[PDB]
Amino acid sequence: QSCLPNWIMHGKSCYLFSFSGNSWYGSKRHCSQLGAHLLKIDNSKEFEFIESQTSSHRINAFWIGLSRNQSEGPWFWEDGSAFFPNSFQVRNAVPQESLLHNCVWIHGSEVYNQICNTSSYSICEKEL
Amino acid sequence: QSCLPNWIMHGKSCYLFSFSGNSWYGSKRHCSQLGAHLLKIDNSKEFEFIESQTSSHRINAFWIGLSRNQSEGPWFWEDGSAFFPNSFQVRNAVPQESLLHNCVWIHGSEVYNQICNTSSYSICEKEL
Numbered sequence: 502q503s504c505l506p507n508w509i510m511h512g513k514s515c516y517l518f519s520f521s522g523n524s525w526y527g528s529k530r531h532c533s534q535l536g537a538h539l540l541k542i543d544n545s546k547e548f549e550f551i552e553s554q555t556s557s558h559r560i561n562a563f564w565i566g567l568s569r570n571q572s573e574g575p576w577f578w579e580d581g582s583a584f585f586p587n588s589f590q591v592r593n594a595v596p597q598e599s600l601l602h603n604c605v606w607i608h609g610s611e612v613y614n615q616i617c618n619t620s621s622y623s624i625c626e627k628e629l
Numbered sequence: 630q631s632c633l634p635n636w637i638m639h640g641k642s643c644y645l646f647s648f649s650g651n652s653w654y655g656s657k658r659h660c661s662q663l664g665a666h667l668l669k670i671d672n673s674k675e676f677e678f679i680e681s682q683t684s685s686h687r688i689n690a691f692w693i694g695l696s697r698n699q700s701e702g703p704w705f706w707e708d709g710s711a712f713f714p715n716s717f718q719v720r721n722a723v724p725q726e727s728l729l730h731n732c733v734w735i736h737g738s739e740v741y742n743q744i745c746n747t748s749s750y751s752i753c754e755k756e757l
């Protein structure tokens with residue numbers, strides 16, 4: 502069971518911390534080109550591991566595999582599974598200030614909705 | 630290089646034509662559980678192959694891996710790559726009638742946007 506150079510092993514996956522600017526869509530294409538996808542956070546153990554990385558690189562936010570279609574509809578993971586907030590809840594959530602913010606990134610220790618094509622860093626995940 | 634039972638080979642890929650009603654999200658999940666994604670159509674040859682399966686099964690529509698994130702914003706594929714209308718264009722297209730329709734499905738020979746939540750068949754794809 503093995504990961505590429507520069508990918509970290511944790512839990513049951515290999516993660517790539519992409520220190521390189523990009524839209525949510527761009528980030529997505531980029532992970533998918535390495536045969537991965539954007540990060541999916543299943544349990545709190547995974548969350549905590551990721552959170553160590555993001556919070557020790559607070560200069561920047563990292564796109565994750567979470568988004569929605571309806572400019573105010575339900576969040577869903579890259580794999581299409583539904584969002585349940587057992588590790589975190591998505592922030593900036595009041596009606597008005599959520600408008601157009603349909604992609605999710607992590608910045609520091611928080612997970613925010615953000616305008617999908619803001620440029621940022623990202624995290625890919627390949628399962629084992 | 631090989632496909633699972635019931636998946637059909639064509640061009641570079643294995644396909645599964647899934648006759649089970651499900652939402653776009655649902656369909657997406659199901660593909661992903663078999664270790665695949667929803668259909669991504671990279672050219673006319675792929676389109677035409679798909680198109681004869683969809684037109685010979687006009688009773689239902691088939692979800693595909695194309696969606697957008699904001700009620701009037703750019704279409705993107707499951708993989709993050711942007712939509713170019715090489716083989717077809719998305720239909721019901723005037724700014725007002727396609728609000729809340731941010732997922733795409735194929736019905737007969739036409740590619741429509743729809744309410745992501747609607748129930749339907751779907752097509753999965755795993756590239757060799």
Ligand SMILES: OC[C@H]1O[C@@H](O[C@@H]2[C@@H](O)[C@H](O[C@@H]3[C@@H](O)[C@H](O)O[C@H](CO)[C@H]3O)O[C@H](CO)[C@H]2O)[C@H](O)[C@@H](O)[C@@H]1O
Pocket residue numbers: 532533534536537538539579580628661662664665666707708756757
């Ligand atoms: O979505 C969760 C699901 O992802 C599955 O992986 C696929 C990737 O295999 C795929 O990458 C494709 C390459 O394999 C192929 O060679 O090239 C095409 C086009 O460049 C790539 O799309 O990317 C999709 C979308 O990110 C992934 O879903 C995993 O196998 C599976 O374990 C996981 O559940």
Ligand SMILES: [Ca+2]
Pocket residue numbers: 514540541542543547626
């Ligand atoms: Ca995960």
Ligand SMILES: [Ca+2]
Pocket residue numbers: 642668669670671675754
């Ligand atoms: Ca394809």
Ligand SMILES: [Cl-]
Pocket residue numbers: 529532538539566579
């Ligand atoms: Cl993804």
Ligand SMILES: [Cl-]
Pocket residue numbers: 657660661665666667694707
């Ligand atoms: Cl998909």
Ligand SMILES: [Cl-]
Pocket residue numbers: 716717718719
């Ligand atoms: Cl057309």
Ligand SMILES: [Cl-]
Pocket residue numbers: 738739740
């Ligand atoms: Cl048509």
